[PDB]
Design a binder for this molecule. Structure first.
Ligand SMILES: OC[C@H]1O[C@H](O[C@H]2[C@H](O)[C@@H](O)[C@@H](O)O[C@@H]2CO)[C@H](O)[C@@H](O)[C@@H]1O
Ligand SMILES: OC[C@H]1O[C@H](O[C@H]2[C@H](O)[C@@H](O)[C@@H](O)O[C@@H]2CO)[C@H](O)[C@@H](O)[C@@H]1O
Lengths: 436, 437
DNA sequence: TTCACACGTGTGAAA
DNA sequence: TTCACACGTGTGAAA
C-alpha cells in the first residue's frame, strides 16, 4: 500500500524498468524520496481489483486502452499539467489519454507492431502473408521456420484480423459505438482462417507464446517474428542481424495494428500525487530520463517532441510509425477489456481446434458486447435467492413442527412436501410424479 | 499441445538453466536427429496435471520431487525403468526422493537447499541468528540499506524459519507420513511465523516482497542478505556484488530447517517418445557434459550424478548448500503436498499482510493441509444426489401447477405454489413463510 | 462416512 | 430490465 514520502511504480515486465529505476534513483538523490520500480504479472488486471480498496502503486504504466475503464471506476487521479508542460508532447498523444474531456495519465511513447526479420536467413522479407507458407517449407528443409509470434495475446494477431475488414468498435458521429462490433465480419473470418490454416498446415503451433517466439527468433531458429519496439534490445544482445519493416499485406491490404500509447496514470488513492508529477514531468519525461529508459528497452515513438526528433531518425522507428499509420489508435473506453478477452478466447479456441473459426468469432462478437452486471445487480440476485430460501425454510419448519406427519426420524423437505401433498388429496410417486 | 512422435518437448521452471538444457537438446538432435524443444511456462507445476490428464502436456517435465507423487497417483507419469547399472550412478537417497508406491516415477537431477546469501562488502560477518537481524537492519537503514529481503510470496522461502523451532508438515512414523498429523499450527510454527510478521511490523521487511523484488535488491546492493537456492548464483556473479553462501541463521538457538528439493524429470505417461526421453535423460542429460551445460547456465546445486557431483562438491557454495540440506529434511512426495503448500502459502501471505493473526492464519492452514480431498466419485455422488433432489421437487410442482387450479398469477415461483398447497391442506402461511394450523 | 440445506451465480424466460 | 429454477460445491449434522 502507498505511504507518504515514497514512490512505487508498476510497469509491465517487457519495458525498461531498470532504466526507469535509474530515473527514480536520481530523483531520490535530488529530493530524498526513494523510488521503487516493480514489474508484476498481470498488472493491468491486478490494479483495478486492488485500487478500489486503496491499495496499488502510486503510478501505473500501461497502454492507453486500459485507462478509460480505470478512470471510469474512479481509480486515477486527474492530470492537469501546466500549459508549458502540455506543449512538450505531441497533441495526438494527449488525446489517447483523455477520457470524458479529462487527461487521465501522462502519455509516454507510441507503440506499433512491426515485422522483425533475420537478414542472414532472409535478406528479402515477404511482402505478403500469402507467401509465408511456401517460405516456411523452404526454411523447414534447413531446420528453420519462417515465422513465430505470440498467439496467446490477440494484440499480435489483430493486424491480420483487421487487414481485410475486421474492426473492434466502429467509430461514427464522433463516438465509439460500444455496440457495433466487427470481430465476426467477412474480413475478420478471412484473417483468422488464414492464421488457423497456418497452424493446420504446421507452419505455426497453436501454443506459441511470447517467450517461445522471442527465444526462437533471438536464437536464429525462426526467420521472422512480430513484436514491438521493446523487443529490440534483446535482439541486439543476440547474434542476429535483424531488420524492422512493414507488416505483410493480406489479400492485398495492409496489416492494421492497434496502436498503443504507453502511459503513466497516478493512483487516485496515493498520498504522493504531487511528488509523482514532479517525478513524471521533470525527471522521466525529459531527454535524459527517456534516454535512460529507452537505453534499457526501446520505448517506440516517444511522446516528448524534444526527444522524438532524435529517435525519429532511427530507421526502426520510421518502420514502427509506417505500421502505425496503417493501423489505428486503440479506443480507451471501458469495454476494451471485454473486447480483448473475447477476441483472445476466439483466437485461442480456433487455433487449438476447439472451435471452428465461424463459431469462435461468432461467440467473440456477443462477448465483446456483453454488459458486466453491476455490484448492485449481483447483490439484488444474491438477496432474492436468500429470501426465497428463507421463505421455504420457514414453511418447512412449521410443517415439521405442527404437521404431525408420519415422517422418518431424518428426512428431507421433499418428504415433508410429499406428506403435505397426500394430506391435500394428492398422490406422489417415488420420483415426484404428482396428481389427484 | 500434444507431444508428437519423433520430437521432444520439455517443461522446466524459468529460474533454472533452460538455455543450458536446450543446448543438451541440440546435441541430442545432432546425434539422433530428434528435435528437442525446451519451454519454461508459468505455473507449470499446476498446468501439467490439468493437461496431462487427457494426454496433452510435454514429453518431459522438470520440477522438485514433492509434486511428482500427486502426478503419479493421477496416472500422469511413466514408470522409470533404469537398468541397475544406471541407478548405481546416482546417489541412493535421490532415487528415494522419486520413489512412490514402490516405483520410480522420475529421474532425479539435483539436490536443492536454500542458503543464506550475503553481500561481503556490506556485511563482512553475517549474522548467526535471526534474533539479531532487527538490530542489524537498524544499523543498515542509517546508511540507506536494509538487512534482509527474500521471497515472501512462496512459502518455500519462509518454511526454514517456521520449521526451526518445531513446525512440521506431515509427521513421519512407522515408515510413512501421517496425512492427518500436520504440524503447521504448533508452538514452533507459531513462533517462527510470529517473528517473521514481527519483522514486517517493525519495518525490517515488506510483506509484498516477491522473488524479483528481492533478487533485484540484493543484486543491486540495496540489501545485505537474501535467501535463495543455487539457481540464483549466476545472476549474482554477473552483478557487482561480492557475495558469500553460508548457513541459514538460527532461530531460538535452533537451526533453520529448509525443506530439501530434488529437481526431477518425469516422463509424461501419454508420450509415445518414452524411449527417446529415457535415452535423452539417461545418456545425454545425466552425464558429466550434460549436467555441466545446464549447471553453467544456472547452478543446479548438488547433482544426483556421483561422477559430476564429486567435482561440484569442491565448490564452497555447494558445501554450504549441503550444510543447510543436512539441517533440513527431504520433502515428502505424497499427493497431499500440493494441499500443504497451498495452505501454508495462504497462511504466510495473510499473516504477513495483517489480514489474519498468526494464530488464525496457521489454524486455518492446519485444517486445510489435513483436509481430505473428496474423490471424483464422492463429488459425483453429491452432484447426483442434489440433481435428484431438485428433479423430485420439480416433478411435484409441475403436477401441482398442472392439476391444482390454485388460482395463481400468470407467472409465480414455487414458494407461491407451496403456499397454495398449504392453505388447501388447512394451513395459514404469512408473507415471510411463517406457517401454522 | 452419508446427507441436507445453504450458497451465489448461471442459463434462459418473459417482459 | 427483473426473475426463477438449475447448478455443483460448501458447511456442518447425524452417525
Ligand atoms: O493482447 C491484448 C492486449 O493488447 C495490448 O497489450 C499489449 C501492450 O499494449 C504492449 O505494450 C505489450 O506489452 O504487449 C501487450 C500485448 O501482450 C493492450 O494494451 C492490452 O490492453 C490488451 O489486453
Ligand atoms: O513455495 C512452495 C513451493 O516450494 C517448492 O518450490 C520451489 C522449488 O522447489 C525450487 O526449485 C524453486 O523453483 O523455488 C520454488 C519456490 O518458488 C516446491 O517444490 C513446490 O512444490 C512448492 O509449491
Amino acid at each position: 500500500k502507498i505511504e507518504e514520502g515514497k514512490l512505487v511504480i508498476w510497469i509491465n515486465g517487457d519495458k525498461g524498468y531498470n532504466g526507469l529505476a535509474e530515473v527514480g534513483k536520481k530523483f531520490e538523490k535530488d529530493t530524498g524520496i526513494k523510488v521503487t520500480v516493480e514489474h508484476p504479472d498481470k498488472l493491468e488486471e491486478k490494479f483495478p481489483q486492488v485500487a478500489a480498496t486503496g491499495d496499488g502503486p502510486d503510478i501505473i504504466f500501461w497502454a492507453h486502452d486500459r485507462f478509460g475503464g480505470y478512470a471510469q471506476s474512479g481509480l486515477l487521479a486527474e492530470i492537469t499539467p501546466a500549459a508549458a508542460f502540455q506543449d512538450k508532447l505531441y497533441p495526438f498523444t494527449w488525446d489517447a489519454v483523455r477520457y470524458n474531456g479529462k487527461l487521465i495519465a501522462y502519455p509516454i511513447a507510441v507503440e506499433a507492431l512491426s515485422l522483425i526479420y533475420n537478414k542472414d536467413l532472409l535478406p528479402n522479407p515477404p511482402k505478403t502473408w500469402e507467401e509465408i507458407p511456401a517460405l516456411d517449407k523452404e526454411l523447414k528443409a534447413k531446420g528453420k521456420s519462417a515465422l513465430m509470434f505470440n498467439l496467446q495475446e490477440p494484440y499480435f494477431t489483430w493486424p491480420l484480423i483487421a487487414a481485410d475488414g475486421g474492426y473492434a468498435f466502429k467509430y461514427a458521429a464522433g463516438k465509439y459505438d460500444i455496440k457495433d462490433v466487427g470481430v465476426d465480419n467477412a474480413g475478420a473470418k478471412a484473417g483468422l482462417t488464414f492464421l488457423v490454416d497456418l497452424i493446420k498446415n504446421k507452419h505455426m503451433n497453436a501454443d506459441t507464446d511470447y517467450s517461445i517466439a522471442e527465444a526462437a527468433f533471438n536464437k536464429g531458429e525462426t526467420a521472422m517474428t512480430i513484436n514491438g519496439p521493446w523487443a529490440w534490445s534483446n535482439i541486439d544482445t543476440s547474434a542476429v542481424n535483424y531488420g524492422v519493416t512493414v507488416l505483410p499485406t493480406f489479400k492485398g491490404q495492409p496489416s492494421k495494428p492497434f496502436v498503443g500509447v504507453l502511459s503513466a496514470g497516478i493512483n487516485a488513492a496515493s498520498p504522493n500525487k504531487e511528488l509523482a508529477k514532479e517525478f513524471l514531468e521533470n525527471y522521466l519525461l525529459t531527454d535524459e530520463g527517456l534516454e535512460a529508459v529507452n537505453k534499457d528497452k526501446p520505448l517506440g515513438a516517444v511522446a516528448l517532441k524534444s526527444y522524438e526528433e532524435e529517435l525519429a531518425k532511427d530507421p526502426r522507428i520510421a518502420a514502427t510509425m509506417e505500421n502505425a499509420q496503417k493501423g489505428e489508435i486503440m479506443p480507451n473506453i471501458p469495454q476494451m477489456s471485454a473486447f480483448w478477452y473475447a477476441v483472445r478466447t476466439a483466437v485461442i479456441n480456433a487455433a487449438s481446434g476447439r472451435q471452428t473459426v465461424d463459431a469462435a468469432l461468432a461467440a467473440a462478437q456477443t462477448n465483446a458486447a456483453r454488459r458486466k452486471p453491476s455490484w448492485r445487480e449481483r447483490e439484488n440476485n444474491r438477496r432474492r435467492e436468500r429470501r426465497r430460501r428463507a421463505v421455504a425454510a420457514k414453511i418447512y419448519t412449521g410443517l415439521r413442527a405442527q404437521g404431525d406427519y408420519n415422517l422418518p426420524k431424518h428426512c428431507d423437505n421433499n418428504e415433508v412436501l410429499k406428506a403435505l401433498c397426500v394430506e391435500a388429496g394428492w398422490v406422489v410417486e417415488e420420483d415426484g410424479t404428482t396428481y389427484r
